[PDB]
Design a protein around this ligand. Structure first.
Ligand SMILES: *[C@@H]1C[C@@H](O)[C@@H](O)[C@@H](CO)O1
Ligand SMILES: *[C@@H]1C[C@@H](O)[C@@H](O)[C@@H](CO)O1
Ligand SMILES: [Mg+2]
Ligand SMILES: [Mg+2]
Ligand SMILES: [Mg+2]
Ligand SMILES: [Mg+2]
Ligand SMILES: [Mg+2]
Ligand SMILES: [Mg+2]
Ligand SMILES: [Mg+2]
Ligand SMILES: [Mg+2]
Ligand code: NA
Ligand code: NA
Ligand code: NA
Ligand code: NA
Ligand code: NA
Ligand code: NA
Lengths: 1011, 204, 193
């Protein structure tokens, strides 16, 4: 039958979908969510064998274990056990596009398990098996006999094994197909893997049982009263003595309880549902649920007899909250949301796509700690525990059907085809059936990147019809189609329009106001965080706050999808597309996260944290005004700390408790600011600290911060007459300067400072030379391939212009002696193919104090692409343990990504000055630096810098961080100006004009001296 | 043109149409019809079927049609004749002046139906003036109402021809038979004969 | 597989639906709606045998005419030829309500036709069969090999017979089920045939 090449057969003998069940036989256990003796895990050690195609599977396998098989842990993805390679392809399908067929060579995983079953499970009731996740399709047999088949790798498939089991030992056999017609609906940009990757369990239900239950919470106008409505359905023989009781608990207190026999109201001419009943409980002054305060109640549904005998109980956590769109705004409990969201894949660098609670918890905590309040399940329903955790920790969730057909041409070829309506519908309907009772789910999504077809319109209405409680969204086809309640584009810019035909991405600000448009706009994906990115993140945040209908977005994305590989010595390293022999592949494009695979943060995360702060501040004189952006809670776990420093040196500080109502303001007057005794800039920093630990943070957690410059007293104090005067030594090839035990050497043919000595110790390995280029970032590269150059990408523009090949030509090198100093003057031109790209003019003034003052004036041809940077660089001979600077930090920051950094005095070990992006590039810059210290050297000025053991040359020549090697000495790059990093997207130039080095003429000045 | 979907005998009538597991099969009956008949000018309205209550499968299908072929309105009488799955109020047997307030799916007088609070659709009976046997009494009352009220845009009489079948007696003479005459049981006897014309097309 | 007791399987190997085609090879004919040599009718005398259930159908029938079959006209409703009774029920289903199951005694009409196909049709192109109306579900075989299955008694079911025919005589075999899960969606107030 080749059921896996027929979209018309998505399952056989599979049971209906329903919310999480446990069939407790004691109500208090249900109340407390304790483990149920009727729900067994079959996770653990199974038998497994891999075959190249289903046709090669021996028939013997159904009856007994294959000797050649191995013992492996389940859940797992077989690629992570090394049986075949995982593939990383973004859009292009991993198989030939010829729906609904799949390759004849179709990797098949044969899993089996021998296990016991108690006769008490068989003597009465129903025993079913539940596969929470099987990628991508499978056949199931039990004791040699065929049971059923299932598709959709992201929702549970359940089958009744009652008639197939026997008391004692039993054997399950599951043949898993890597590819099936289901794969055409699973073209998500992520690793392509397969296997039994989520939990396997046995659930025992009584013959007369709760087969489904839906919970709704409706409210009055001010949320002071609610009605909890619970619709319950049963299976089994109806009897008049049957009853359902639904009770609602707030902790140990029973809030409400209602009981009724089965029999719903009349629905139509044929009557009503004799097998269902609806209980309605009134709740006064309900504690409302939100991401801010995730208040929850527990609903217990008991199926029992009139005499009081319990048959079974099911239950769920309940969050009282209303979500609605009104007058163009998305409201939660009647207040407009501001979504600080992120998209998050189920990815583990060691286990593949297998999720565990510890990883989920770790993610949730980091998310919350970083000011996120929402998550989009890109792009499929998640492991069931995920929702339980969001409900309890408190995160707004967008639940998304497992439908993505990006690889089709055009994108909606399948979604507009009615023959694919059935398969698509199951992906949507079964998700709703499963997750509809979770309060954290606030919006349903019809999937991702599948164009816009009539099937989406049909499914959009299905949802609206069965669950009016939550809006429906979908981005395909232009982001504002008839299948979406929310304008939810991906990578639409803040101000800049991208008018692509048919599916333009308008500036978000303009999109809102297009003629006739009235819906709210929340980006389903924005701020692509690939590598050194997040340039312009503040720009989004400023617009979201200014425009009521701009209600936020989901950054793309949480975690890099890198996988661990092991070298010859057995040491681990981070792998990406192509690293498993997979081809074609999309290389590093699977690494777009705010965190590395192991959950260590990328520097961008801190920018996200700061822009997503929940407190806004303004300063007026001694007055600080704090405004709360919380909609529901008071700042009852917050204190404001403040500190004033002069150039890094603390002058004063203090603390004040914060007491601001949601959306309110609090004024705090600072105390008279005692003048300071020295020139310099005073800076005020404030931070919001939570004194008490919470379910998601530790005591002392800093949730927000801001700085301001206060008074500045410029230095007018004339130095002091040097103790000695430097001497100039002129020779044919060099100008040397001697002062005390220091010496500087300027080569007359090169025109650069080629050597500097402290005593007899050389301080340079490479001369001090200008630098106009940087080791390309992922955003600079875009999709450009050596095999397929994208001429519009920054890196390609720079290459083609000769920036990376340009050589310095000396125009002038002179030396003069002044009354107390020696002055060297140089001029160089950088040319390529006979065109002058850059001209650098400098003076080096070395005085009796031993300081070397460097002045740089550069001209950049107007017709050359704007350069990546305008600075100097050199390889220092020494290596020192720490880096100390007075500037922005402490973490890496760039022009368009420095709002989170603070101006102060920082001191870190040298390795912290290098950011180990998996795909190496320019990294570790710090901007706004007035003083830099390393070894006995000090540089003063107003520059940007990076310092590390790796040259730009190496970084640009190396594709994986694990292959970099520390060079001798330390590479120092000191920039008068550095181009922004961009990131609005990573496949087209995205650095905003205001961050491009287009001025034409640039000036900077530095002083290098010894310390 | 109406999809081949009727599940009248279910209890309640929308038991299957509100069940997503039945969406695929219902879907094929609506999409395959549209695909085959959409170029005929004589088709002016699509119908989602008959007497299958009102289920969410109806709403999804109603939308699919609206999406693929905006050129013709979509109607469906199930669940009360004025649900969200119909562009036209299309009751069956609603009376001219008399209301029949059945619970859940009342049959309002047609004149009154048009003006219920918030209502603005046209009203065209999907079935009216049940022509069973000696009938059609009160026919003129409908016509007088259709002409006086703009939004009462008429109706489809129930129905054209008696579903009688020919049987032969002992003498070989033909005779008109109805429910139960073939030994069929249970059956609904003469209820299958409701037309304006006899099975051979002779007019009643 | 008992595809007729599974609303998840409404067809197997059926072609997409589409407006009326005739594949004219002369445009003027297409203009005037004249008969097309590319659209042939298979209506007329077929072979038919009635069985009380699908399980009673002999395997011989796939490859060879059953001698007991009679010759009858097609299209037709088998009740009209007297093989079983037509039933008139308004609302109550004519079968027990237990979806998606149908009775085990399920009247099965075994139709077959031996017919010619010119080589010209087989040398190039696609030859499909079109059944404008089969009530209520059916399996189709051509020259003994299974081709596909179909439901919905009131729309055409089309199958590509290209790889199954041969020049000259060919034999079709159609097993038609009176009741199927499609019957649950066919409760109109009319005779059940
Ligand atoms: C939006 C969709 C997501 O799956 C990714 O492909 C992202 C680009 O990395 O764009
Ligand atoms: C409307 C539906 C039609 O099929 C018949 O049942 C009529 C009454 O004979 O009502
Ligand atoms: Mg399939
Ligand atoms: Mg994609
Ligand atoms: Mg700031
Ligand atoms: Mg009777
Ligand atoms: Mg079927
Ligand atoms: Mg001719
Ligand atoms: Mg022959
Ligand atoms: Mg009826
Ligand atoms: Na806003
Ligand atoms: Na990606
Ligand atoms: Na406080
Ligand atoms: Na690199
Ligand atoms: Na009128
Ligand atoms: Na009738």
């Amino acid at each position: 039958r080749r059921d896996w090449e027929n979209p018309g057969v998505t399952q056989l003998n599979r049971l209906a979908a329903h919310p999480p069940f446990a069939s407790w036989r004691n109500s208090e256990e249900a109340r407390t969510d304790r483990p149920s003796q009727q729900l067994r895990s079959l996770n653990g050690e199974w038998r497994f064998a891999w075959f190249p195609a289903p046709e090669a599977v021996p028939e013997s396998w159904l009856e007994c274990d294959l000797p050649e098989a191995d013992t492996v842990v389940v859940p797992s993805n077989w690629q992570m056990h090394g049986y075949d390679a995982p593939i990383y392809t973004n859009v292009t399908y991993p198989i030939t596009v010829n729906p609904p067929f799949v390759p004849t060579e179709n990797p098949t995983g044969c899993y089996s398990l021998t296990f016991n079953v108690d006769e008490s499970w068989l003597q009465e009731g129903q025993t079913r098996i539940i596969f929470d996740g099987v990628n991508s399709a499978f056949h199931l047999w039990c004791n040699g006999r065929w049971v059923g088949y299932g598709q959709d790798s992201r929702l549970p498939s359940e089958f009744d094994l009652s008639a197939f089991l026997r008391a004692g030992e039993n054997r399950l056999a599951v043949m898993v197909l890597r590819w099936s017609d289901g794969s055409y609906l699973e073209d998500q940009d992520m690793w392509r893997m397969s296997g039994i990757f989520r939990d396997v369990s046995l659930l025992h239900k009584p013959t007369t049982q709760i087969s489904d239950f839906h919970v709704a919470t409706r409210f009055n106008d001010d949320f002071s009263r609610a009605v909890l409505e619970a619709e319950v359905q049963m299976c089994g023989e109806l009897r008049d003595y049957l009853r359902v009781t639904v009770s609602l608990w707030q902790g140990e207190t029973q809030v409400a309880s209602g009981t009724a026999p089965f029999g719903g109201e009349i629905i139509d001419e044929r009557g009503g549902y004799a097998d269902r009943v609806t209980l309605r409980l009134n709740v006064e002054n309900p504690k409302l649920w939100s991401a801010e305060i995730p208040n929850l109640y527990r609903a217990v549904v008991e199926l029992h007899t009139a005499d009081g005998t319990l048959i079974e109980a099911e239950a769920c956590d309940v969050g009282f909250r209303e979500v609605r769109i009104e007058n163009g705004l998305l409201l939660l409990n009647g207040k407009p949301l501001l979504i600080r969201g992120v998209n998050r894949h189920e990815h583990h660098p060691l286990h593949g796509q297998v999720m565990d609670e510890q990883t989920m918890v770790q993610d949730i905590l980091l998310m919350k700690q970083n000011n996120f309040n929402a998550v989009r399940c890109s792009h499929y329903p998640n492991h069931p525990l995920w929702y339980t955790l969001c409900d309890r920790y408190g995160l707004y969730v967008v639940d998304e059907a497992n439908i993505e057909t990006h690889g089709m041409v055009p994108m909606n070829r399948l979604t507009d085809d009615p023959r694919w309506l059935p398969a698509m519908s199951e992906r949507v309907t079964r998700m709703v059936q499963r997750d509809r009772n979770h309060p954290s789910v606030i919006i349903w999504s019809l999937g991702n990147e599948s164009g816009h077809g009539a099937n989406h319109d049909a499914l959009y209405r299905w949802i609206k019809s069965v669950d009016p409680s939550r809006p429906v969204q979908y981005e395909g086809g232009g982001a504002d189609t008839t299948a979406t309640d929310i304008i939810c584009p991906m990578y639409a810019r803040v101000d800049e329009d991208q008018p692509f035909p048919a599916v333009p991405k308008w500036s978000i600000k303009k999109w809102l106001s297009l003629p006739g448009e009235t819906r709210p706009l929340i980006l389903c994906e924005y701020a692509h965080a690939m590598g050194n990115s997040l340039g312009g993140f503040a720009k989004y945040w400023q617009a979201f706050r200014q425009y009521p209908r701009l209600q936020g977005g989901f950054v793309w994305d949480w975690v890099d999808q890198s996988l661990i590989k092991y070298d010859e010595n057995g040491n681990p390293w981070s792998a990406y597309g192509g690293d498993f022999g997979d081809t074609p592949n999309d290389r590093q494009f699977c690494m777009n996260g705010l965190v590395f695979a192991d959950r260590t943060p990328h520097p961008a995360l801190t920018e996200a944290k700061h822009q997503q702060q929940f407190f806004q501040f303004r300063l007026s004189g001694q007055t600080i005004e704090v405004t709360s952006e919380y909609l529901f809670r008071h700042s009852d776990n917050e204190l404001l700390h403040w500190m004033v420093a002069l150039d890094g040196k603390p002058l004063a500080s203090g603390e004040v408790p914060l007491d601001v109502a949601p959306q309110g303001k609090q004024l705090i007057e600072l105390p008279e600011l005692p003048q300071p005794e020295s020139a310099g800039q005073l800076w005020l920093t404030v931070r919001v600290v939570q004194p008490n630990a919470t379910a998601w943070s530790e005591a002392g957690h800093i949730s927000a911060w801001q700085q301001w410059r206060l008074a500045e007293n410029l230095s007018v104090t004339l130095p002091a007459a040097s103790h000695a005067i430097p001497h100039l030594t002129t020779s044919e090839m060099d100008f040397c300067i001697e002062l005390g035990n220091k010496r500087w050497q300027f080569n007359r043919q090169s025109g650069f400072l080629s050597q500097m000595w402290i005593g007899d110790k050389k301080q340079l390995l490479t001369p001090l030379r200008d630098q106009f280029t940087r080791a390309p970032l992922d955003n600079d590269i875009g999709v450009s391939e050596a095999t397929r150059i994208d001429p519009n990408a920054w890196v390609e523009r720079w290459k083609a212009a000769g920036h990376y090949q340009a050589e310095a030509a000396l125009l002038q090198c002179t030396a003069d002696t002044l009354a107390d100093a020696v002055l060297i003057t140089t001029a160089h031109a950088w040319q390529h193919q006979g065109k002058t790209l850059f001209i650098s003019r400098k003076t080096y003034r070395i005085d009796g104090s031993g300081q070397m003052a460097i002045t740089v004036d550069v001209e950049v041809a107007s017709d050359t692409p704007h350069p990546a940077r305008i600075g100097l660089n050199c390889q220092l001979a020494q290596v020192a343990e720490r880096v100390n600077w007075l500037g922005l930090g402490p973490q890496e920051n760039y022009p368009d990504r420095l709002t989170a950094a603070c101006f102060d005095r920082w001191d870190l070990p040298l390795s912290d000055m290098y950011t180990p992006y998996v795909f190496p590039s320019e990294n570790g810059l710090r901007c706004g630096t007035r003083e830099l210290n390393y070894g006995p050297h000090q540089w003063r000025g107003d520059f940007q810098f990076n310092i590390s053991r790796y040259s730009q040359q190496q970084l640009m020549e190396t594709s994986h961080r694990h292959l970099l090697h520390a060079e001798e000495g330390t590479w120092l790059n000191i920039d008068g100006f550095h181009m922004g990093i961009g990131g609005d997207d990573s496949w087209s130039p995205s650095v905003s004009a205001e961050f491009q080095l287009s001025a034409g003429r640039y000036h900077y000045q530095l002083v290098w001296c010894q310390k």
